[PDB]
Design a binder for this molecule. Structure first.
Ligand code: NA
Length: 502
């Protein structure tokens, strides 16, 4: 078992028994940009002797570089401590807890005694007390928020409770992870344990977000009982049904569905909430709900009723002029809003409010594409094409929307493959020459972390200034480049920063 920390530990022990200058110093330079990263076990076994040898070997020679690496080795270690989180919550909180104990091991009082023993400083920006404070706050708050979202989530798993329904207030996609990116945490942003925690919390949070919106249009009174029951069927199909258990329905929701569905005109037929195939398919009718004289569908949420619409767009149907005027109002409002908005929360809310639940967007895509195969579209069909392309891609990026480094990669894959998926529709409607990648880019674009890397750079410059200043009056430490290259190379490697320095 060799590892970077292990390699420099063994290298540094032999130095203790200006050749030691070149060897020692090139060794530090080699540790700061070793390709691999430290596993928790390695840090836990090797933290003590490496720190002892570094503090005493520091004491004998008194170079600024030993002083700095000793003063800020905790943070430089958590910068390189690998994190792998499992899908299951138990395994995830467990796995995070082992790292909490790893940093507690790094930031022990023994390190403060061995730094103060060597005349060093324990209050360094990446020093033990600071790294301890920031990591502890971030991880504790991380559990509290992640479990909070995990409780008000659709719980269809084998894991036994009853899913909350009326409980939920609409949460934006970014609000849970928002406190965890404040500039206060800039010092630890490149750490894998922030990024991994943020993808986990993003995955739970976004699901809770969609579930919140769709619940909101469940419990609305202005909507017609037909529209109400339709949102109910969609909710059940997409968030409360698994291949493993047929239907997972709370008794209050099922009773509410019963009383609301008995109000519907028997001209339109609705299946009861009970366990294959989705329920939304089971709905059958012959009435043209789109006609304005007809009062059955709320003109607000008119695309919620997937069978009649999918028939409209597969069969290229020609609605009554009043019905069509009823459509182009909603479709054209929705698409004007989507076209001219940069808030993902707003576009989510307006897609769900219009009845454009993700699976619907899918069926709609399928319906048009199949139309263009057999056949140049009406404005109804073209606008459904717009909202369904942009809707499918916004809903795809929505699950993983976060401020972590991987959303750049996923976002690149998705906007790259946005237009080419269902190319006939996309070119026929106009999103062809990069326009859809432009829209998805403006609304779902990944956040830019230049400020966090700048701030951390300034802090590392400061620890360089003090650390050299005490140990070398003039300040010509050769290791500056070696420290800054990690910053630029992280920036362009994970975040694709250009990069640039002041
Ligand atoms: Na930089």
């Amino acid at each position: 078992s060799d590892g970077p920390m292990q390699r420099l530990l063994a290298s540094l022990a032999g130095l203790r028994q200006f050749l030691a200058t070149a060897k020692l110093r090139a060794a530090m330079a080699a540790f700061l940009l070793s390709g691999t990263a430290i596993a928790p076990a390695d840090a836990r076994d090797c933290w003590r002797p490496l720190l002892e040898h570094l503090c005493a070997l520091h004491r004998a020679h008194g170079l600024p570089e030993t002083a700095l690496l000793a003063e800020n080795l905790p943070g430089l270690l958590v910068h390189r401590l690998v994190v792998a989180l499992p899908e299951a919550p138990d395994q995830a909180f467990r796995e995070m807890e082992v790292i909490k104990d790893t940093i507690l091991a790094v930031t022990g009082s023994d390190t403060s005694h061995a730094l103060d023993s060597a005349g060093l400083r324990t209050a360094a920006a990446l020093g033990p007390v600071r790294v301890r404070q920031c990591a502890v706050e971030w991880i504790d708050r991380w559990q509290t928020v992640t479990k909070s979202c995990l409780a008000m989530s659709p719980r269809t798993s084998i894991e036994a409770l009853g899913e909350t329904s009326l409980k939920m207030a609409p949460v934006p996609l970014g609000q849970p992870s928002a406190n965890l990116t404040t500039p206060a945490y800039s010092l630890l942003f490149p750490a894998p344990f922030v990024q991994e925690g943020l993808r986990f919390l993003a995955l739970v949070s976004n699901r809770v977000t969609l579930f919140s919106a769709h619940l909101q249009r469940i419990d609305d009174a202005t909507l017609t009982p037909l529209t109400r029951a339709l949102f109910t069927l969609a909710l059940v199909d997409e968030y409360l049904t698994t291949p493993e258990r047929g239907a997972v329905v709370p008794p209050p929701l099922l009773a509410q569905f019963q009383h609301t569905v008995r109000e519907i005109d028997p001209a339109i037929m609705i299946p009861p909430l009970e366990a294959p195939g989705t329920l939304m398919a089971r709905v059958r009718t012959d009435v043209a709900v789109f006609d304005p004289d007809v009062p059955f569908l709320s003109s607000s949420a008119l695309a919620v009723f997937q069978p009649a619409v999918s028939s409209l767009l597969q069969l290229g149907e020609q609605p009554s002029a009043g019905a069509q005027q009823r459509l182009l109002a909603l479709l054209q409002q929705t698409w004007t809003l989507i076209q001219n908005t940069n808030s993902p929360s707003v576009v989510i809310n307006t897609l769900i409010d219009a009845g454009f639940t993700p699976s619907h967007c899918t069926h709609y895509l399928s319906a048009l594409e199949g139309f263009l195969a057999a056949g140049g579209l009406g404005e109804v069909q073209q606008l459904f094409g717009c909202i369904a392309l942009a809707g499918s891609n916004v809903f795809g990026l929505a699950r993983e929307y976060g401020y972590y480094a991987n959303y750049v990669k996923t976002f690149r894959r998705v906007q790259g493959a946005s237009e080419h998926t269902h190319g006939r529709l996309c070119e026929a409607v106009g999103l062809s020459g990069g326009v859809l990648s432009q829209t998805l880019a403006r609304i779902m674009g990944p956040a830019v972390p230049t400020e966090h890397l700048a701030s951390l750079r300034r802090a590392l410059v400061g620890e360089f200034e003090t650390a050299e200043r005490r140990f070398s009056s003039g300040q010509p430490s050769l290791l500056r480049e070696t420290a800054l290259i990690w910053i630029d190379v992280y920036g362009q490697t994970h975040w694709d920063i250009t990069p640039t320095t002041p």
